[PDB]
Amino acid sequence: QPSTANGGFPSVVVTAVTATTSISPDIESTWKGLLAGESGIHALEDEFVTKWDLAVKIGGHLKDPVDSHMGRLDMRRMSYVQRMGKLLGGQLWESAGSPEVDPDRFAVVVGTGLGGAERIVESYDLMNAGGPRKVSPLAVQMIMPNGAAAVIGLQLGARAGVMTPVSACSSGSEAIAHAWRQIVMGDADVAVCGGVEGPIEALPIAAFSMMRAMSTRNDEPERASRPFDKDRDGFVFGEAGALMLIETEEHAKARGAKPLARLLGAGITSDAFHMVAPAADGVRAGRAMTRSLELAGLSPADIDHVNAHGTATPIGDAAEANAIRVAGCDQAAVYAPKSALGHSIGAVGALESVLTVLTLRDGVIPPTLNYETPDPEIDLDVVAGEPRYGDYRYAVNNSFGFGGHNVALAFGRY
Amino acid sequence: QPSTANGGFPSVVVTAVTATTSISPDIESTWKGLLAGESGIHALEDEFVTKWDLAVKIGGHLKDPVDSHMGRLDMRRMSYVQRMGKLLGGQLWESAGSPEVDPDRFAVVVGTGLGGAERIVESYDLMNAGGPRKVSPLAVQMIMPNGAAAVIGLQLGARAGVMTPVSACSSGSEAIAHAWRQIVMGDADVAVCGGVEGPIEALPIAAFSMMRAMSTRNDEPERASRPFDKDRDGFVFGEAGALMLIETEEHAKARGAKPLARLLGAGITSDAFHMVAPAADGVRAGRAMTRSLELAGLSPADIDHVNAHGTATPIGDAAEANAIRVAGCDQAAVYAPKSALGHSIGAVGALESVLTVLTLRDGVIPPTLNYETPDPEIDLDVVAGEPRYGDYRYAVNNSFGFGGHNVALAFGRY
Numbered sequence: 097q098p099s100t101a102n103g104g105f106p107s108v109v110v111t112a113v114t115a116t117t118s119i120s121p122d123i124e125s126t127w128k129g130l131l132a133g134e135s136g137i138h139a140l141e142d143e144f145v146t147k148w149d150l151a152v153k154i155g156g157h158l159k160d161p162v163d164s165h166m167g168r169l170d171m172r173r174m175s176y177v178q179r180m181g182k183l184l185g186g187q188l189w190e191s192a193g194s195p196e197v198d199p200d201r202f203a204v205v206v207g208t209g210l211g212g213a214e215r216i217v218e219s220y221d222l223m224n225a226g227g228p229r230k231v232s233p234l235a236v237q238m239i240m241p242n243g244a245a246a247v248i249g250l251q252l253g254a255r256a257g258v259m260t261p262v263s264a265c266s267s268g269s270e271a272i273a274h275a276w277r278q279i280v281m282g283d284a285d286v287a288v289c290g291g292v293e294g295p296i297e298a299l300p301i302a303a304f305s306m307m308r309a310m311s312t313r314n315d316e317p318e319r320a321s322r323p324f325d326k327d328r329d330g331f332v333f334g335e336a337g338a339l340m341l342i343e344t345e346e347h348a349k350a351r352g353a354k355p356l357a358r359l360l361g362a363g364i365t366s367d368a369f370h371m372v373a374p375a376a377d378g379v380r381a382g383r384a385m386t387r388s389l390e391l392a393g394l395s396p397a398d399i400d401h402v403n404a405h406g407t408a409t410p411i412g413d414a415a416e417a418n419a420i421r422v423a424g425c426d427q428a429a430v431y432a433p434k435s436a437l438g439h440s441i442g443a444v445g446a447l448e449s450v451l452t453v454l455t456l457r458d459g460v461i462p463p464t465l466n467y468e469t470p471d472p473e474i475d476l477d478v479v480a481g482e483p484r485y486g487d488y489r490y491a492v493n494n495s496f497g498f499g500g501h502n503v504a505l506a507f508g509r510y
Numbered sequence: 511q512p513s514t515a516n517g518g519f520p521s522v523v524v525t526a527v528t529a530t531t532s533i534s535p536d537i538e539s540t541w542k543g544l545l546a547g548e549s550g551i552h553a554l555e556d557e558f559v560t561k562w563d564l565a566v567k568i569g570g571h572l573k574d575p576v577d578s579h580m581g582r583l584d585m586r587r588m589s590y591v592q593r594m595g596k597l598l599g600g601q602l603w604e605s606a607g608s609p610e611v612d613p614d615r616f617a618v619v620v621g622t623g624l625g626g627a628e629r630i631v632e633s634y635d636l637m638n639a640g641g642p643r644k645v646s647p648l649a650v651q652m653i654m655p656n657g658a659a660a661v662i663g664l665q666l667g668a669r670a671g672v673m674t675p676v677s678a679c680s681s682g683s684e685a686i687a688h689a690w691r692q693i694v695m696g697d698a699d700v701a702v703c704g705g706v707e708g709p710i711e712a713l714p715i716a717a718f719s720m721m722r723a724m725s726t727r728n729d730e731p732e733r734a735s736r737p738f739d740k741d742r743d744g745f746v747f748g749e750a751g752a753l754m755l756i757e758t759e760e761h762a763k764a765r766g767a768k769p770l771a772r773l774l775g776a777g778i779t780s781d782a783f784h785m786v787a788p789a790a791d792g793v794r795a796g797r798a799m800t801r802s803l804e805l806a807g808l809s810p811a812d813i814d815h816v817n818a819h820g821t822a823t824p825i826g827d828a829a830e831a832n833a834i835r836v837a838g839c840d841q842a843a844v845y846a847p848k849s850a851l852g853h854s855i856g857a858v859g860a861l862e863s864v865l866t867v868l869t870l871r872d873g874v875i876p877p878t879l880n881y882e883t884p885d886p887e888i889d890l891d892v893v894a895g896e897p898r899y900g901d902y903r904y905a906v907n908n909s910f911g912f913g914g915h916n917v918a919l920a921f922g923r924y
């Protein structure tokens with residue numbers, strides 16, 4: 097039975113990372129912000145909060161808006177997610193030292209939660225005002241939900257597959273999983289992977305609020321997101337997108353890139369339980385963690401760190417706690433980054449994958465913000481108060497989404 | 511190096527199929543229609559063709575509309591693609607003899623081109639008329655593009671992964687590819703896979719017409735779709751969705767299911783050429799065919815039959831012809847089913863995968879309709895005039911989409 101530890105799969109390393117967040121456009125500044133207990137979440141100033149009388153009045157917009165970096169041409173040929181992908185694509189390649197790779201061994205895997213949804217309302221309004229010929233010959237290529245991956249593959253020259261997995265909130269982790277398969281199966285040597293998501297708008301707030309999924313703790317915006325805390329009351333939106341460069345160890349050596357971490361395995365399962373709620377018993381979600389460990393060649397006793405999905409809903413954090421016990425990883429140091437960065441649906445698995453890699457490289461877990469009263473029924477070792485410096489050898493990043501989609505990624509210290 | 515032929519990958523068989531088309535709701539009736547040279551394409555009667563003065567006035571709606579099979583509850587809890595998936599899901603499981611499989615070894619992989627796009631216009635109109643509380647607590651779960659896969663996984667009890675790949679026109683073939691990986695990597699023993707797509711509407715017609723991608727041969731609707739013909743002038747929309755049940759040979763034996771065919775390999779590459787046009791040289795697309803053969807353990811001399819993507823655009827059929835030469839498969843008997851069934855974007859790879867399986871089981875290729883003058887520059891053995899009965903041992907189904915996404919699937923006669 098092939099594993100990473102026994103040489104059945106080739107060794108895969110993470111050689112570059114890039115992200116844009118509500119704390120910073122630069123991933124290293126974001127990481128420093130996290131370690132100093134900064135939050136990205138504030139009062140929404142947006143005129144549409146008063147327009148619609150929304151229950152929810154908080155969230156984190158990007159520190160540096162994407163469209164600050166976009167001229168008139170970009171602004172009319174691409175959806176927002178494609179613009180975000182082009183920016184992040186371009187940044188990642190520079191950080192990697194702008195290498196010349198073999199196009200035919202190069203893959204792109206990028207997820208989103210939703211896609212170019214603004215551009216269909218637009219295209220419908222143009223056809224209403226002025227007929228079928230007022231639809232852009234370009235329209236298809238903005239509208240298609242593989243759109244951001246298409247733009248990155250085209251921008252960087254990826255010829256060994258450009259894929260887009262959609263699994264709501266676990267999209268950006270699933271992308272990284274499939275990029276890892278694409279390589280250990282022989283289809284590629286190098287891959288760009290991650291996830292992009294649109295900005296905070298009024299409809300998604302309405303849809304998630306109506307589920308009672310979201311915090312309405314508006315008087316203290318930085319204190320709203322409380323994963324695993326006895327007093328949590330739902331999640332908070334925080335904008336993001338993130339990409340990472342992965343490649344075989346042998347490929348990285350040959351080009352002199354220094355690895356940040358290894359990516360060792362991926363497990364994908366599903367709940368078949370409910371369309372939006374996670375399964376309470378956390379069994380299938382725990383099994384995804386186990387599957388990554390099997391494929392890595394690890395035991396649960398090797399897992400020092402879990403980067404939790406921790407959305408801060410009551411049933412969500414309860415289910416994940418069960419998942420972690422089920423996997424046998426409940427002795428692990430836990431971090432819930434959504435406590436500081438919020439939930440960014442399709443992107444967030446990817447950004448948290450980047451945080452997990454930085455935890456391994458730097459031997460430190462930022463504090464989970466607002467964790468002030470352990471829930472009796474959770475019983476996890478949640479990092480809090482200040483960063484915890486520790487000997488972290490292996491970690492699991494969890495990502496679950498609506499539909500009951502479970503993704504777990506096993507990373508190792510290089 | 512693992513292959514299907516050398517035992518490196520387990521043997522995977524197709525044990526059930528189901529589809530709904532412009533010819534028939536029943537796949538066996540569709541297949542008989544094809545073999546008798548029926549077309550699904552007719553004059554569009556839709557009031558919106560005269561409303562908008564559309565250039566395009568032809569296409570094929572489903573013989574049997576999905577919503578004929580849907581009561582008021584379905585009609586308000588699911589998008590159209592989810593309704594289509596529920597119907598096809600339910601039909602496939604019956605055809606398979608309604609077996610009891612182990613939920614934890616059972617995967618679902620279903621692609622679409624676009625998703626629940628109607629339901630965002632609706633949800634926006636409800637919030638405009640009456641505020642944020644008029645958005646459904648159910649809305650998220652209709653709107654999410656993993657929606658049709660979510661519904662099938664939940665309906666059938668799939669707990670070893672529910673995935674949705676989006677790659678425009680190759681979505682439904684890519685789904686089947688990933689279902690095949692999910693099994694030969696050990697993650698599953700059984701999988702439901704394929705693709706669903708929405709109905710013919712006015713916006714997609716406007717968007718594809720503005721590209722000059724579509725036939726406007728309105729006076730002879732059945733003669734419009736002409737793949738590889740010297741006189742082709744673009745594609746024609748034809749509604750569809752299709753699913754197949756795949757599982758290991760050993761699993762099929764144990765439950766007494768008789769296989770229709772084997773699924774032997776899958777190759778995915780990309781063009782990095784253009785956002786919507788295929789690469790003229792057809793190299794990367796040919797390489798996807800080659801990749802399936804490598805993974806199968808076949809040589810190009812073993813390929814008797816190619817089920818072509820053949821959309822009937824000038825540059826599309828030209829590129830694919832080059833792809834097939836590049837792969838070394840140009841001695842093969844070629845069929846272009848879009849000549850009779852039209853193009854159904856995300857579904858169509860899946861339906862053509864089903865046709866390829868029936869070609870292998872029955873040793874017959876339907877005629878490519880309207881193929882009346884071979885293009886000098888194509889030079890392929892296109893089946894035409896009447897069905898060609900032949901000794902077809904192995905076949906390749908090709909599927910390419912906008913973005914330059916290439917998928918090839920290698921099937922064998924059981």
Ligand SMILES: C=C/C(C)=C\[C@@]1(C)SC(=O)C(C(C)=O)=C1O
Binds near residue numbers: 265371375498502
């Ligand atoms: C398997 C997990 C499912 C179905 C749901 C979760 C826990 S994931 C997520 O992001 C989320 C919320 C409320 O946003 C959930 O409540």
Ligand SMILES: C=C/C(C)=C\[C@@]1(C)SC(=O)C(C(C)=O)=C1O
Binds near residue numbers: 745789823911913916
């Ligand atoms: C690699 C293939 C690309 C980018 C485009 C194709 C040939 S696929 C397709 O379905 C299509 C049309 C016009 O519908 C194309 O013109």
Ligand SMILES: [Cl-]
């Ligand atoms: Cl242009």
Ligand SMILES: [Cl-]
């Ligand atoms: Cl209900």
Ligand SMILES: [K+]
Binds near residue numbers: 405448449493494495
């Ligand atoms: K996480």
Ligand SMILES: [K+]
Binds near residue numbers: 817819863909
């Ligand atoms: K085909």
